[PDB]
């Protein structure tokens, strides 16, 4: 096996993940089977305790674990299904060694941070790097290891020990390191010294960088590259630079044009992977398809405006997957994405006396947008405004997607306005009883579950985007579903539930009959959107906002003929 | 409250504990209420998993937890009952913060090594420093904090962060630090540089030493003190030196004569503790009694030779408490202690053909000794030789003490030789059934439990040493007890069980009627031996080995008239 | 005596000098006698070898040494005459200890970087801090020590050793340190970690900061101050911040409003300086006069445009003193300064075919400007264009100042256009002989020398600005003077030499009779411009460019009535 560490810097937030999965997207250009592990220095075992206000969105796996949010950036860049084990955390590894301590697996020795815990970290990395995350069941050929925090933190010290020892447990010419570092510009001059002091830190703990990659406000000057390479064990051609680019999807082409892979090919001696012709071809095809979606961003002539309406939209990382799912789809439509961020509570009739100015800004965004999106918010607060946003797109033929709480609110609105029933509400308003629009179903429902189309719904816009396939597989995070008692009334009035579960009891998709595009999903489709294969419910929202939905379904926008 | 850190060095094993509890023994000379915490960098939560072969003896508390062995050094030096919480460990504190993470006590924040875990360590130190470990229920006035490992270890990095922040959570003029450091002598010259490089390390993590204390092969030269104080923020009078001394019990007088406390009095402004006259007097009396037991070591004219017979006596830390209990008692008898270490298996009739040379060395030790001691060994291996050592002291009137497995073997031997019954054995040889000398009693029996003298046994040598008090309280670690069915036969033959438990079902002490000193205890009395109050079963063993037992009971050897 | 170090950062160029002399300007607000030392890590002994292209202008002392350029920033901020010894450099101190090594002043000991060279640095700082640099001959009360480079450089390591030892040779409560450090803003967030890593570096070498001062793109957030003070031994009120301000002369008011001195008053216990009432008053008056010149910058309604015409004006530090002399004077005139930078060679008739575009930009600047300034350039290259700039201001009544080479070119032009004599040139064109406008006078003439007005010249605009005083004292740097043989012809034609030397042989000032303001000086007056007392030849240039020269001479712009 081969491995690539991405680590480093004098600051957290320097740029690692885009240098990480982006480096891993280019390993796939070579035809390689590829995987990724994110090592987190924080002490949470999982994001299941972490509220979406800090550390952001609880990204959800095929295996239904609430992971680190960043893992998602690797399932889009590489096109892989990761697992709950690919997110190493400081709380996860202290728990695993402490479990073995009380089980007595150390044969009554004292157990130490070195060597026992640093062995555990190496034994975890080489365990997880066997798992076949890729489009065929063979073990990966390269693993990208991203070390979070900064080298020299008292929180990241166990992992730089474990990785140093791993440079020997794995060989040189099988392991390499990319160190990401700061070139601050002050008084209009690029200063090298934070890279010198952080490389002094790096060699102290015993890792040696095979590349340096700079966060800089500028293109690095020719002398700045020379004054970094005069102070580190790299040639001047391995001081990489992730400068300003037209969009984040260009970074793997930027790295490839900086000859980043033409070094890693030699430095990891990748002629030693015995690839079949099918893999070598599928590598070149993935690069061609990347050049196509990238070209479709530069060659983008016209804007699509989408209002994303939810709780606390100020906290923009809390909707990160939703944004990326809209970006992947917008490059298929060749159209520039313009998300309007609406706080759902600013739409309310009460907000007009309380905070009038922001209420007009919110309603201008809703009134301007070519599509509406209710994104699967957290808790009840935003609900009353999200109802009026769903009403706005039901009545006037605006394209719409509701995700999770958005299906809940598409159904509450269609109840509250098409059936009358003005008292109806989420099951969250428990003591109203008779008018609850939803029912509890704890089984929380999580992870990849199937969904099956109802066999008559040949008219459906959404089941056309899925290619007329009989079923789909999707991620879930819900404790409530629409009350089955009401569903015949909603189906008879035209809110047709075009997809249900294995039992047929659970409401998984709705489409409103004879509207240009009004969909909701109980699942979160943004947790399976990929840059070359956009998630179908979000592709339909952008394509109908562009007024091109028919031609996207007919195939006028696939990447290769 | 006031606090004293003891930390440091370029090596583990430099001398901390003797500089720690020894500094704490002198805080008690001032009359202060005193406590101690040992911070261990290892990842075991407790010594209950740790086999006695590495990290040594599982020291046992009043509260019955299997602690770090070193805690014992503080219960002898200070005269305090500690608790399972006074041994902070890296595995204990990661477990406590990870428990709060899954309970959700962090209110859905991400939880970090800084500030959350470094707050947990400070909140633990100031929690535990409230506990009244001393001879009256008031909270301690000084806490001695010993930081294990070395500063600059990747295992000790969380604790030097937590202690730095603690220098502010507690004030300066309430916290002080003693750093213990190496002065190697090579080519006959004292080199200062390992102290310079380790003090550079110390100030990097942000602690500042109020004293330096040197491990050195010599008295520090006047220039060595000056060349350390020219490189650290200490006066030349605060470079302390724990040099070679007549015995370890002299170290608090060495520190006091080096004016170590005459600085800490000012540096911790200890006039601010409002002591009552009773405390001030009991402080001076504790110093006088220390000068007495110390004088009784220098003024020691004659040797007592004791054979300690057990499994794997090569592993001398595995019997550490037993050695210290013999030392405390030997200073009461004014006699020099000479422990002969015997491997119990080398006494066996089989060892004579297998390894004849070591078998003669073992038997010469048994034949020479003025007393025999079977120390409460681990597992079955040594048993056959320990029987012959108990027989040797039953028949010939040699003084004897059996501790735990030693009472078991005193009873197996008295069965195997006085009752005949040559097939009898420990309950460990389970499938013999009918001839098992013991019975299972899991309740493992642990911690401080009472023991009550049988009301007729006024003749007893051991219940005389306990001052004719009605009951005693002692530590236990046993899964087996002598089978109650047999005890009438043993009592009638003269192996009188002079002490039993609350129920009267359990065999806690035996004394053989009409022998000069042949005792065993099911408890481990070495876990309550103190330097001014020696544990009575061990005092009797030394005093009878000295042939002075009568006069020790009559009071010819108490420290003050 | 008291002392203040200014040091630090993860980068060179962070802001030290403005935090240094600015802190020293506020020590003078307290009435204190004040001095400054700049410690340079570079190996040049003096700027006399350093070409003005790199490290910039060779600033010149009262004592005529070619110093570090930065010393000037302290002679403006404090109002002091420094000496060649106030610029400590790595080349200067290795030379001084190596001289004592060959003289044998070490009594045949081996001489070491510690302690001998670190003693030399301390013995230099306390030597120089005695020198009476101030407006009365008493020794200074505070010394500001600026440590150049960054802490943790292999070039600055001898000085952080010497300063650590100096924290003891001088007492605490006599020495304090200000550490200047970076808060980079990326992704719109202020990151603290470069300050944590550089403070870890600082405490390693053993200095402790009594203040931190941040270079930041922003006002520091309340949490950024707290997260620095949680990681350093400073209160949150001693994390100072030199943010963006209207001009550099506001920084001492910014520091004073951040309560910077209200701490240093206590931290250096400055009630212990026994000031007389005259000093206490002159302190408050200096603050009032600073508030006045600062107010005159904010209250500045109208611009003055000045063309500064010379060689290589792209290298803007090479003219630094000239810029500051124009700034000090512009605040007296209440007018906003706008220096147009002209490359002198772009004015040439040859430049019109060679590089036409830049030639028009150069001539637009010359044609726009309200005043012309020829700044005392280095070498011959620019001369031909500087002639045409002097002609432009002779003929059309534009205000003019020529400094050094500018007097040379004022005289070459007046010769070349008023006397005819079109072949005349600088003595630099040696082999023309008969038409050389100048003569060699090596004595190089350097340092503070007098100049005496010619006793009839009561009409003079410049000798009016000097207050009708009989003589002036000024800095020089010249190897050529105007040929005395010609001076009668120039005086008779109206280029009156209104000032000459002690002998009357040397051409020190000229004024053209009956022009609104056309001055030149052979000396460099910008080496004695101060912020409260602007250098008179530059005050006249700004005031005549403003058309207000009469009223400045009559006194309509002095700071206090
Ligand atoms: N392939 C990627 C990589 C990053 N991002 C986005 O960029 C931001 C985070 O970038 P990252 O690469 O993780 O840098 P930071 O986290 O800011 O810093 P670090 O280097 O510490 O990860 C987030 O919006 C993340 O979703 C993304 O959309 N796609
Ligand atoms: N010396 C330190 C300081 C912090 N941490 C931990 O590592 C993380 C790094 O986060 P970082 O972005 O460094 O936060 P700050 O320390 O505030 O750094 P910044 O100021 O850039 O946020 C911290 O959250 C904390 O978990 C650490 O290990 N060692
Ligand atoms: N009051 C004390 C202190 C120490 N010792 C003994 O000395 C040895 C350990 O000494 P210690 O002070 O702990 O030093 P080390 O552990 O060798 O090193 P460190 O400084 O790391 O603790 C053990 O036999 C311990 O029982 C003792 O008998 N009584
Ligand atoms: N931090 C230090 C200390 C000393 N030196 C210099 O390097 C030499 C090393 O000599 P050394 O043997 O280290 O002398 P000491 O510092 O006293 O070390 P030791 O105590 O082993 O003599 C010193 O003489 C002094 O010249 C140095 O460069 N850096
Ligand atoms: N009282 C001052 C201080 C500084 N400057 C100007 O500001 C620049 C240099 O600022 P300085 O304070 O020296 O910062 P740097 O040299 O950039 O960085 P350092 O902190 O390393 O000195 C130069 O134009 C210098 O003349 C000035 O005009 N007046
Ligand atoms: N590790 C180093 C590197 C350089 N220097 C010296 O200290 C000076 C600091 O200048 P600096 O501004 O740090 O130059 P760079 O090293 O290039 O840093 P920058 O990239 O910010 O210019 C250097 O010129 C060199 O004299 C040093 O002492 N130690």
Author numbering:
A (entry chain V), B (entry chain F), C (entry chain D): 1 to 443, 455 to 572
Task: Provide passages from the article that reported this PDB entry.
CTP synthase (CTPS) catalyzes the final, rate-limiting step of de novo CTP biosynthesis (Lieberman, 1956). Each CTPS monomer consists of a glutaminase domain and an amido-ligase domain connected by an alpha helical linker. Glutamine hydrolysis in the glutaminase domain produces ammonia which is transferred through a channel into the amido-ligase domain, where it is ligated to UTP to form CTP in an ATP-dependent process. Budding yeast have two CTPS isoforms, Ura7 and Ura8, which share 78 % identical residues.
We solved filament structures of both Ura7 and Ura8 in substrate- (ATP and UTP) and product- (CTP) bound states. Ura7 filaments reached lower resolutions, 7.3 Å (substrates) and 3.7 Å (products), but the overall structures were indistinguishable from Ura8 at these resolutions. Because of their higher resolution which enabled building of atomic models, we focus subsequent structural interpretation on the Ura8 filaments. Like other previously reported structures of human, Drosophila, and E. coli CTPS, the yeast enzyme assembles as stacked tetramers. However, it does so using a completely different interaction interface, which was the same in both substrate- and product-bound yeast structures. Helix 356–370 in the glutaminase domain mediates interactions between tetramers, so that each protomer is involved in assembly contacts. His360 interacts with D370 which would be stabilized by protonation of His360 at low pH, and likely explains the pH-sensitivity of the assembly interaction. Residues painted similar (yellow) and different (red) from Ura8. In addition, Ura7 assembles with the W363/W392 hydrophobic core shown in Figure 3.
